[PDB]
Design a protein around this nucleic acid. Sequence first.
RNA 1: UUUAGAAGGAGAAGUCAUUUAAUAAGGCCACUGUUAAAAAGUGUACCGCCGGAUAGGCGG
Lengths: 295, 172, 125, 253
Amino acid sequence: LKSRPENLSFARCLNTTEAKFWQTDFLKRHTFKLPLLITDKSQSCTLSTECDTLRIDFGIKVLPVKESMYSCSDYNYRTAIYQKIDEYIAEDGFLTLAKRYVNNIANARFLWRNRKGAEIIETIVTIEDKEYPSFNSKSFNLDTFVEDNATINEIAQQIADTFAGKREYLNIYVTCFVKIGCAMEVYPSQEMTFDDDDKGKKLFKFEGSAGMHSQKINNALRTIDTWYPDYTTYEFPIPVENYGAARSIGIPFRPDTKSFYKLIDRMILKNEDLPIEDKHYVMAILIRGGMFSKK
Amino acid sequence: MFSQILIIKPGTGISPNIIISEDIFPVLHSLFVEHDKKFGITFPAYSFDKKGHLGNIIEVLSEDKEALASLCLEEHLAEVTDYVKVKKEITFTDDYVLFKRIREENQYETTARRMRKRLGRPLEMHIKKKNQQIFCHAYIKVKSASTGQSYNIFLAPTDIKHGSFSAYGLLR
Amino acid sequence: PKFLEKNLAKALDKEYLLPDINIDELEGVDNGCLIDEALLPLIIDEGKRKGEGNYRPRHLRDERKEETVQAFLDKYGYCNIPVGYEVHHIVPLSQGGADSIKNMIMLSIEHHERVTEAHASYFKW
Amino acid sequence: KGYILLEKVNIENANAFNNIIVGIPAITSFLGFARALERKLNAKEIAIRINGVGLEFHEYELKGYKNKRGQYVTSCPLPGSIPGQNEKKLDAHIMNQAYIDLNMSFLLEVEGPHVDMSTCKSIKSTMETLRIAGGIIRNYKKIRLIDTLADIPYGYFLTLRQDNLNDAAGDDMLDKMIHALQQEDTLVPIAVGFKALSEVGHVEGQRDPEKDHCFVESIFSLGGFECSKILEDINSCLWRYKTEEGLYLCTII
RNA sequence: UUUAGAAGGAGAAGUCAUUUAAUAAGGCCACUGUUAAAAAGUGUACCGCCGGAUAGGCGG
C-alpha cells in the first residue's frame, strides 16, 4: 500500500427519502390528514387556520458498510479497508454511531426551524410494520447524546447490525407531529435559483404539496461529530464532513491532521492504529459516502 | 454599569437573528416595559463589514445590580433553553458599547405616507439613497404588541456610555 | 521576430473604451452617485453595448488604480466611499473599459449586485 | 548593487541604418544612451553609475512598407538644407538612411548609495530630456526597481551569439555570418562596436579639441532573441562596455 | 557625450467586354459515466406624530 487509488468512492450507507408535509388536527391525528399546499407571492406556507399541527413523513434505508464501497481501483486497498471494517466491527458493532443517529431522530433535529417554539413534538419510528412507542422529543436537548433509552437502544441495535452486515437492509419509516398555532408559518426548504431574473424565494414542492429536500434531513442526521479536536471550546456537535466544515461558522473544525484524508492515509497507508473517537469519525464518513480518490 | 450575558447557541441550525427577533428581543422588551425602562442592550460581537451583523451574543445592561437580578432572566427564557444560554453571573463592567435606534428609518414610504396625509423626483431619489444608507446597518424585526404593526428597528453603535434608554433598551 | 511587428490588432488592444452617458448630466445621478434606480437599465445597456466582442485578457486589461477612485471621489468632494456604496465601471475592465473617471459610477450595494449579475449573465463570466 | 527597469518605452524614428545593416540600431546606441543617463544623473549629484544594460523588445515598426515580394522599402524624410557648397538650393541631396520605431524595455544594472524610489523619480524627471539612438521618447508605462526575473513583463531580450558565428562553416567571416543566418533563421546581425583604424591622437576638426580621438570601422556580429520567461540568469542579457587595445566593444559577460 | 546634430514627398485620373463545371459512388463494426452535497443570506418592510418644510427629528 502506497497511496489512495485513482478512483475511490463509497455510496450512502444511510439513505434518506424526501419528506412530504401533511396537516392534521392534533386530537385524532392518528386518523386524519390533509395535503399542505404552497401559497404564491416570494412563496410562503402556512397551516390553513384550522388544524394547528403539521405532519412529516419520510423514509430511511440502511445498507451494510462493507458492501457500500462503490468503486476502488486497487484490490489491495479494497482488501485492507474491508479488513479494517471487520476490525472496527470487532471493537464495537457500529452501535455507538447507530445510537448517535437514532438520537438525531429522537431529538427531532431534522425539523430545522420548524422545531423552534412548537408546543409538542411527537416522533414515531416504524420498522417492518412494527410501530415503536413515540418519542417525546422535547425531553432531548441538542447538545448531549442519550445512551440508555430502551427505544433508542433497540432501533440503534437493528441499525448497527445492519451496518455490520448481519442484515441485507433495514427500511425505517419516520413520522413526526409538530403542534403549532392555527396559522403559524411552516418552513419547507428552498430551491436554488440559477440567476434567473425571478430571484424571488421559491419553495420545494413534492407531489404538489410542500416538502423538504433529502439533503437537509440527511445533514441533520449527520450532526453526530463531537470528536473534533477542540470540542471542549465549543461543545456543539457538527455535521460530519471531510474537513468538518460548518455552514454557520466559517472556521473548519478539522483542517490538517484530524481531517478525514490524513486520518485515512495514516490508518491505511502507514497501518497506524488511532484513537477510538477518530475511528468512529472515519467510519462515520464511510457511512456518509463520498469520493476519496487521489487528489 | 452592571451587566448579564446572553449567548445564542451555535449549531442549532437557526440563524441567530431569528432567535433574537422572535424569542430574546420580545422578552427583553417585555421586561423593560414591566420594569420602567431602566435597562440597556449591547451586542459584544457586533461587526459592520459590508452589512451589519449583531453576532450570537447579547448583554443586558443596568445601572443597578439588584434591578438587573430582579429580571431573573433564567426563569423567563426557560422554554427556549434548547438554544438560548444564560450566564449565571452578573458582572460589573467599565467596558461596554451602547446602541441607538437610527434617527431615520424609511423616509421614502414615510414621505409617501405624509403626501397621503398632505413625490418630486429629486426628493424621492435623495430619500431613496438615505434609505439605502440606513438599510446596511443591523436590524431586528419587531411586531408591536400595542398596535400590531410589524417593522425593522435599525441599530447603530455609539461611544456615548450614559443616558436614557428606550423601551427597547436603546440610547435615546 | 515577425510576431512582434506592430499591427492594428495590437494597437487597438491598447486603446480603451468609455461610456457615452455623462454622470454629470443624468437626472437621477448626483455627486457621481446613482441616486435614481430608474437609470439602471441604461447603465446595464451601456455596459452591454460597449462590451460586446471587446474582451481583453488579464495581462492586457487596465489595472484598477486607487488614484482613479480617489480622483473620482475628489471631483465630487468625498473623503471616502460613502457607507453602503461601491464604485463601478460602466464598461467592465475585462470588456474594454478604461480605468478612468469618465468610466466610473458609484452605486448602492444592491444596485451594484444587480448590475454585476446582469453583466456576468450577458458576457458569460 | 540593484536593478532598475524602464518599462515599455516608445521610441519614434530611431536611427535604423548602419553601413551593413538596416533595422535594429547599433548596440552602442543603447549603451551610449544609458551612459548619457548616467551623466545626467551624476550632474544632479545623484551619483548613480550604470554598469550594464539589458534590451527587451516588445514591438517594432520599420518606417516603410512591404512589397508584394515581401521585402521592406525604407522611407525617408524629405531633406532640408544641408550645409556646404550647395546649401542655398531648395532641393537637397538624398543620402543613405533608414528609420525604425521601437517599443522597448531597458533593464539597468546600477551602483549607488541610495538606489530606491527617489532615484527612480529622478530618472523619471531626467529621462524626458534624452533621446534613444536619435529617436524621440514619446511615452513609457513606468520606471521601477525589480528584484527577480518574474518581475519583467513578457517580452524578448536580445543577447550575443558569438558561439554560433564561430561554429559556422569556416570559409570566411562574412560566409560564416551568411551560413549561420541561413541555418539559424531566428538570429540577426548587429553592430557591436568599433575597431581603431588609426593610432590614438589629436586631429583638426574634432567635436571636442581636448579628448583623444580615433578613426574607426564599425564591428558587426551575430545575435539572437531570448524570451524573458525563459531567461535563467539575469547576467545572461546584461550588455556591458569593454576595451581591448584598439577594439571598442559591447559584450555580455 | 548614443553612425551625435537637421528635414513638407506632392498635385491628377473610366479597368472594362464575353462565357455549360460537369459524369459515378455502402462509412460501417464494439462499448457500464459514476460516487457526494442545509440555498441559503432575518429577500423586504409597517402606521402615525413634530417640523412651511423637500431640510431635520420622533413614537410605537
